[PDB]
Amino acid sequence: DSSRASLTRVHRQAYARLYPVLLVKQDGSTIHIRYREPRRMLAMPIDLDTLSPEERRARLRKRE
Amino acid sequence: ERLKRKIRKLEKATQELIPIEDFITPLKFLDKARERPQVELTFEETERRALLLKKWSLYKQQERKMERDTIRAMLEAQQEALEELQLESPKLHAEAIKRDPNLFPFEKEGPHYTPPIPNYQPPEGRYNDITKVYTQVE
Amino acid sequence: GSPWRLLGALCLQRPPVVSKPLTPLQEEMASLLQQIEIERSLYSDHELRALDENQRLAKKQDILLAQDLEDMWEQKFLQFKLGARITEADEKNDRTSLNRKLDRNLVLLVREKFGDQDVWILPQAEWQPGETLRGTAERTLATLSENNMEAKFLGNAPCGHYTFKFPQAMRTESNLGAKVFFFKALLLTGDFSQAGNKGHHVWVTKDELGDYLKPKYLAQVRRFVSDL
Amino acid sequence: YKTKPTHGIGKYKHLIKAEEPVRAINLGTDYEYGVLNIHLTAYDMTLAESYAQYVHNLCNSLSIKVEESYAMPTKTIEVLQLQDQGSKMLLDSVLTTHERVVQISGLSATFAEIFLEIIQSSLPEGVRLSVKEHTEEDFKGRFKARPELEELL
Amino acid sequence: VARKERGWRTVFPSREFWHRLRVIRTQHHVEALVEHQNGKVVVSASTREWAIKKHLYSTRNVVACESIGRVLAQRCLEAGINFMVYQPTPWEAASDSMKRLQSAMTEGGVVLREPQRIYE
Amino acid sequence: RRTPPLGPMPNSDIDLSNLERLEKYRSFDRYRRRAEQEAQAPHWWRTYREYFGEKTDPKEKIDIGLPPPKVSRTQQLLERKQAIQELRANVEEERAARLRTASVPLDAVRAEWERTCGPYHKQRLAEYYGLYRDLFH
RNA sequence: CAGAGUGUAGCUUAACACAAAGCACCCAACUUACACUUAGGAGAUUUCAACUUAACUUGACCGCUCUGACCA
Ligand SMILES: [Mg+2]
């Protein structure tokens, strides 16, 4: 299962403290990660540039 | 003619591997200000950590036993089917032992912690990559 | 030829959607590993930013302190609601839905009528000359209730095989029985449509496989079906 | 001595595979795959490294030759989320992507389904498993580019 | 004055001794032997023995290796064996198990170094 | 002119067709363990054991002592297994072993040793000292 | 259900007794990883009797595999 190789720690001799952070993906699924600051959740945003030009013409008003 | 001679000699420079950031320690870490106080541990705590790691050795061993048994069960089941298929239809068996051509690339994603929320609108933004560029120079 | 009908079966599996819940010992080992990580870890940028605030208190320009930032961060997390790991299907025990038992791996079981009897089996289709045995298994997916399911067949070798013999009335020199060869596949995307969801299909885990399958049939299905 | 029955009692080089003191390509037979690359990409460096170690040790248990185990250059991405009631994107967080590659050769045709099942089921959360057949393009991806060479082209 | 088997310079271990201490560590047990250069075993202590095994929590840890040394040292003195050579590998010598086992032998009266042969 | 070997040659079972697939030693200790075992075995070729090893009668040494005592292995194994489980149960025993403070009572060891392996260790010592060779031929 | 063989933990024609052994395994540290090495971890005679003894020979007992029957 997922727990087969999940439980671990940073194996570097010198490393800065990392805090567990829930990364919320665009679909809304969340995965635990290690982040520099003691945040509780991180949300990955939808990138506007990827949007096609036909949609952006009509999504310009929708974005508002 | 001069251009051709140069092209032949260009390959003498061997390729150089791209450094890996993960292995390279950051310089900021060297500073002794960014050092944990290194608090010592109590006697009772060392017992709890030692006994816990003893339990971990055996729990992991049982985990490996199930994985080893699972592969053994699958291998025997697959072999028996291959033996039966050969007897029943040798021509069909020959196809079954061939290597799958369209199998790869095989891409799989780890299971998330929570399932995706149906109605979730992520606040739009932009992804900017800071990856450096390393070019080999004679 | 032979009195054995060659049939190909499909072992369609839905791989875990969510990570499994850590067990008691794993819950302890996880905390110990986190504790050990902190002890051997150098001070983080946020940690140092907080030490400066402590020095300021002893003596007596960022208005927001390190602790103040953490308070704001916590508020946002509490507001956000995570997707339920245990779905509404688990409450209703609706075994016809791909939503239930996200952590576990489900298998597809279809009810077909054989000898005027309702028997749960893996989707199967009779072999047609000129097609590989795995080709038959792929055909089983198409020859089902209306569905958009897409599957990734892993390899061409049969995972397992179950042999049964027809009853005396059906049993004859021409048709004694059938040879069923199973083929594993992963359900990448898609599900049975609402029109085809009336019944005769149940997504079940390995533990629940015995409830629907026969004794001898179950014994062979379990071998290749992964417990993990 | 040559004549004596014990001639050759101390020959050992046949026992050891000869090694010669740019790299030949390897492909597979109709019943075996060629060199394969197992790409373990995960935002958490520990999880990527952890599963790379697990896959390597699993290959040893199955007597599967592991040609090489290494890492790819870390990928850093800046997540600039729109500031409230503002038209200018502001940096919110930096996310690194860490990739570990385990190279295996000689994987059997029949056994491939068994191997993929085991390493697919044990995948940790947030870790992406991509298995690709080895190719010269991949090996050149770990070596720096030569603009000067391209300029001469 | 007895001659030691000199030679064997290109191979390991040396044969230039009258008695040697050999420690055999298995997956489950620890064994220490004192044997003559001719291959005969003079005295031995092993965790397989019930006399030693019943007083040990584990028969494969450092404590077992130290206990074997203490027991073997007593049996050595009773057999009149005061000197022997110990021929470990680089990793065996560094290990704490062999350090503790050697200390027990020396604290038990065994020198672990043999006197030089008297040629004249 | 070549002479056929007078027996199985060393390193002949090793299949050279699949050299890469064979399991290597990987460690000095594993090779040495196998090397010592091979040396002990008898060989058709000339060996150091022949010229330097003592020549003794092949017939087994006559045993002129008292008969061995009768022991019930099933009961003996039962009690010993229960004794070790009792010893290992104690938390103090595990802690002493983990912290490397535990020791064995030398006096108690020798008392049990005399009852169990001591007669066979004294026989080995007497054999090494030549007492049997000189006292009972 | 019936017949047949079969039984030490994963393997072993390990087990004379002085003893359930050797190796294969699992964790931690080292190693990018592997390997090596160090320091740790888990353990079996299916069960009960049969003349002292019996992991071993006898019977039952239980498990195991194989074959045939039942068997859509
Ligand atoms: Mg390891």
UniProtKB/Swiss-Prot annotation, chain B:
One MF annotation (Gene Ontology) recorded for this entry: RNA binding
Entry superkingdom: Eukaryota
Predominant location: mitochondrion
Keyword annotations from UniProtKB, A to Z: Mitochondrion, Ribonucleoprotein, Ribosomal protein, Transit peptide
GO cellular component: mitochondrial inner membrane; mitochondrial large ribosomal subunit; mitochondrial ribosome; mitochondrion; nucleolus; nucleus
Disordered as annotated region, ranges: 103-127
Tissue expression remark: Ubiquitous.
GO BP term, example: mitochondrial translation
Places the protein is found: Mitochondrion
Record family assignment: Belongs to the mitochondrion-specific ribosomal protein mL40 family.
Assembly mode: Component of the mitochondrial large ribosomal subunit (mt-LSU). Mature mammalian 55S mitochondrial ribosomes consist of a small (28S) and a large (39S) subunit. The 28S small subunit contains a 12S ribosomal RNA (12S mt-rRNA) and 30 different proteins. The 39S large subunit contains a 16S rRNA (16S mt-rRNA), a copy of mitochondrial valine transfer RNA (mt-tRNA(Val)), which plays an integral structural role, and 52 different proteins. mL40 binds to the major groove of the anticodon stem of mt-tRNA(Val) in the central protuberance.
Full protein name: Large ribosomal subunit protein mL40
Species of origin: Homo sapiens
Gene name tied to this protein: MRPL40
Swiss-Prot record, chain C:
Gene assigned in the entry: MRPL46
Keyword Mitochondrion among UniProt keywords: yes
A single BP term in Gene Ontology: mitochondrial translation
UniProt name for this protein: Large ribosomal subunit protein mL46
One matching Pfam family: MRP-L46
Xref: CDD domains: NUDIX_MRP_L46
A Gene Ontology term for the protein's cellular component: nucleoplasm
Family named by the database record: Belongs to the mitochondrion-specific ribosomal protein mL46 family.
Main location: mitochondrion
Organism: Homo sapiens (Human)
Subunit structure as annotated in this protein's UniProt entry: Component of the mitochondrial large ribosomal subunit (mt-LSU). Mature mammalian 55S mitochondrial ribosomes consist of a small (28S) and a large (39S) subunit. The 28S small subunit contains a 12S ribosomal RNA (12S mt-rRNA) and 30 different proteins. The 39S large subunit contains a 16S rRNA (16S mt-rRNA), a copy of mitochondrial valine transfer RNA (mt-tRNA(Val)), which plays an integral structural role, and 52 different proteins. mL46 is located at the central protuberance.
Keyword Acetylation: yes
Protein's cellular compartments: Mitochondrion
UniProtKB/Swiss-Prot annotation, chain D:
Chief location: mitochondrion
GO cellular component assignments: mitochondrial inner membrane; mitochondrial large ribosomal subunit; mitochondrial ribosome; mitochondrion
Keywords associated with the record: Mitochondrion, Ribonucleoprotein, Ribosomal protein, Transit peptide
GO terms (BP aspect): mitochondrial translation
Localization terms from the record: Mitochondrion
Assembly mode: Component of the mitochondrial large ribosomal subunit (mt-LSU). Mature mammalian 55S mitochondrial ribosomes consist of a small (28S) and a large (39S) subunit. The 28S small subunit contains a 12S ribosomal RNA (12S mt-rRNA) and 30 different proteins. The 39S large subunit contains a 16S rRNA (16S mt-rRNA), a copy of mitochondrial valine transfer RNA (mt-tRNA(Val)), which plays an integral structural role, and 52 different proteins. mL48 is located at the central protuberance. Interacts with OXA1L.
Membership in a protein family: Belongs to the mitochondrion-specific ribosomal protein mL48 family.
Name the record gives this protein: Large ribosomal subunit protein mL48
Lineage: Eukaryota, Metazoa, Chordata, Craniata, Vertebrata
Gene for this chain: MRPL48
Residues of the full protein shown: 48 to 208 of 212
Swiss-Prot record, chain F:
Protein's cellular compartments: Mitochondrion
Positions in coiled-coil regions: 73-101
Domain of life: Eukaryota
Assembly with partners or alone: Component of the mitochondrial large ribosomal subunit (mt-LSU). Mature mammalian 55S mitochondrial ribosomes consist of a small (28S) and a large (39S) subunit. The 28S small subunit contains a 12S ribosomal RNA (12S mt-rRNA) and 30 different proteins. The 39S large subunit contains a 16S rRNA (16S mt-rRNA), a copy of mitochondrial valine transfer RNA (mt-tRNA(Val)), which plays an integral structural role, and 52 different proteins. mL38 is located at the central protuberance.
Family the UniProt entry places it in: Belongs to the phosphatidylethanolamine-binding protein family. Mitochondrion-specific ribosomal protein mL38 subfamily.
The protein's name: Large ribosomal subunit protein mL38
